Amino acid sequence: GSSGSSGCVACSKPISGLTGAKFICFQDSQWHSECFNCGKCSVSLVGKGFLTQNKEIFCQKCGSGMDTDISGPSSG
Ligand SMILES: [Zn+2]
Ligand SMILES: [Zn+2]
């Protein structure tokens, strides 16, 4: 996206380019190590495998899309 610059999606600070910092590039957006985590709990996703549903980033346990039943997790 050559139209402008940006900062860490999680804090908007300007990333120190390729100066040697530890960063992640997901969907061309910028994330820092300390800012890469499960949206539902904040556990660091740096190391562990992450999940992506509804464009959101979650941990395995939280994103466990178990095909339990077609009723239960709804108003009933
Ligand atoms: Zn940050
Ligand atoms: Zn979680």
d(CA 72, CA 59): 22
Residues with CB under 5 A from ligand 1 (ion): 8, 10-11, 32, 35
CATH for 53: 2.10.110.10
Instruction: Give CA angle at 70 (66, 74), nearest 5°.
Output: 95
Q: Which ligand is nearest to the CA of 56?
A: 2
Q: Please, which experimental method was used?
A: NMR
Domain boundaries, position 58: 1-76
Q: Which ligand is nearest to the CA of 48?
A: 2
d(CA 20, CA 5): 19
How many independent structural domains does the chain possess? 1
Residue 25, strand partner residues = 30
- Give me the DSSP letters along 36-75: -B-TTT--B-SSS--EEETTEEE-TTTT------SSSSS-
